[PDB]
Structure 1
């Protein structure tokens, strides 16, 4: 395969469906990326992740650089080898988790922080850590602007991000092995302000990336406002490259985002809430800990093709979660990631068949 090729096979409105071809495999778009925090998609073997239909996973740079360490993973052969996932891996650039999870000192150079011991991240180190991990899709080092932000603060933050975007580009390009085998995505910032989003889009396009993220959303603004910002922001991005909305989201968030032009998603919601007892169903989420499932012999979801729904009942999984059993986390997680992959498959198919608008409407009437 090529280093990177994005092809759009079909369109409906702003929605697109297609493929990203990369050396380690093909990514069907719109894609959902299960999250591998610390070199594991929690409670799943990689074969199980693959079995659910995932084409690519995300790795968190912040966690990895702290434990087990990027240089160590490099010494051991790279993240793919280490965790046993041989398909593409997208790595985040680390700043978002630094600011939300670590003491910190921000500067034009980057950020120094204390592990939750003293560490540094900058455009150059971020890009080098992603290289050491052997990431397929490298994210530019950015600043996710807190919400709400005043226009002045949003602008200052966005401008720094665009300076860091150029630095990220140059660091990536300076490393031949990385530039020849990996892709680099830029991240748009600008909070909820259309002109700042535009300036950011322009800056990123002039630098040039393999793909473009819409950064700075799903940070407390709510779905209405996130959709409003996507409405004007995604058309600013190059049409012929993938559009990634990081940290999103609930099933309806994903559907609405695809309607507005997004091709890629990641979120911990299916894994984390699965361990928390929340199961996604076509009729909306259920909390399996609830007493009403204690004798319910139906599967988590009536239609789901996953192995969990083929084999075990709500009543059993209720018991496991109640009991704090590891197999409960395993089964809930497998189902929820399978459910997300089936959602993405239905989106892809409906776009390919020009019935996505109808799918979105049907999905919503039943889910709610």
Structure 2
């Protein structure tokens, strides 16, 4: 396989389905990328967490993230900046670990180097997150810095031969909710040139209507022939609507967070399995789900395990939620390929929000 090749196999409206080929494997798009410490074609590693425990140099000494996690397929790492204080400047950010008080710095160059030590296949440029809401001036200043940092990230990546030849680099569009800033950001990223383009700054609590409004104008600004990654999104209905707006890749902690907190995703909406209404419910978590949990165990049993404090309950919930997300993506890919995605999205919303 090539280092990186994105091909679009079919389209419906703004939605696309296709493949990213990389040395370690093929990624089917639209893709959901689960956290690896939770089938999927690619998993996400949390650079901020890994640089603090066990440390990037230690991960490299252990053979890199692929060996460490037992995962030989592609891995995407974030830059570490979002989760990341002792000092902030045009150079980068300095911060102190709560785990042990150790001092750490992150910059475009250091973030790229940490991601190199982790051995990831898709590397994210290091940027400055923009809070929500943001004034036009603050959003512009933050976006402008992020574009300077995108060039620094590009140069650092290109200087590391093993990384340049075997990994890929994505740039991140910023600009808050402002169309003109989103355009300036897209133009700057395309001038630098990246293997894929993320839409940043939209997992900030703005609400789905506003997120969709910004995606409506922002995704068309990115190169059509490269993947589009919506970072930190989201709920099943967020994913469906974002695909309708041209997004190809997603990540979110929701499936694993929900699975540890009693919430299961189903085609009839989320359910809180701890509720007493499930104590005698012999149906599986979801009646169509093909996952191993739903083939074997009832809502009543999973309810019991969680209420009893048994670790097995949260594990089965998490397994189901991860599988549900992958089945959602498979249905999205098949429906786009078959020219029935618009109908799928309509049928999906009607059932998901009925909450039956």
What's the TM-score bracket when you normalise by the shorter of the two chains?
Answer: over 0.9
Q: CA deviation at 1:182?
A: 0.2
Call closer, same or farther: CA 1:37–1:206 in 2, change over 3 Å.
farther
Contact conserved, 1:33 with 1:57, CA < 8 A, in 2? yes
Q: CA deviation at 1:105?
A: 2.2
Give the match's secondary structure for 2:169: strand
Distance across 2 between alignment mates of 1:28 and 1:299:
28
Query: Equivalent residue for 2:76?
Result: 90
Contact conserved, 2:7 with 2:20, CA < 8 A, in 1? yes
Q: CA deviation at 1:37?
A: 5.9
Give the match's secondary structure for 2:301: helix
Contact conserved, 1:248 with 1:267, CA < 8 A, in 2? yes
Q: CA deviation at 1:324?
A: 2.0
Normalised to the residue count of structure 2, the TM-score between the two structures is 0.97
Distance across 1 between alignment mates of 2:281 and 2:195:
48
Give the match's secondary structure for 2:293: helix
Q: CA deviation at 1:321?
A: 1.1
Unaligned runs of 5+ in 1: 40-53
Distance across 2 between alignment mates of 1:291 and 1:115:
42
Contact conserved, 1:37 with 1:60, CA < 8 A, in 2? no
Distance across 2 between alignment mates of 1:93 and 1:351:
31
Q: CA deviation at 1:38?
A: 9.6
- Aligned residues: CA RMSD: 1.3
Unaligned runs of 5+ in 2: none
Q: CA deviation at 1:35?
A: 1.4
Aligned length: 350
Q: CA deviation at 1:104?
A: 4.3
Normalised to the residue count of structure 1, the TM-score between the two structures is 0.94
Distance across 2 between alignment mates of 1:308 and 1:170:
46
Which stretch of structure 1 is more off in the superposition, 109-118 or 60-69?
109-118
Distance across 1 between alignment mates of 2:30 and 2:230:
11
Which stretch of structure 1 is more off in the superposition, 112-121 or 263-272?
112-121
Distance across 2 between alignment mates of 1:267 and 1:37:
13
Distance across 2 between alignment mates of 1:230 and 1:162:
19
Q: CA deviation at 1:161?
A: 0.1
> Cα deviation per residue 1:225-267 (whole Å; 9 max; x = unaligned)?
0000000000000000000001000000000000000000000
Q: State yes or no: 1:72 paired with 2:54.
A: no
Give the match's secondary structure for 2:82: helix
Query: Equivalent residue for 2:169?
Result: 184
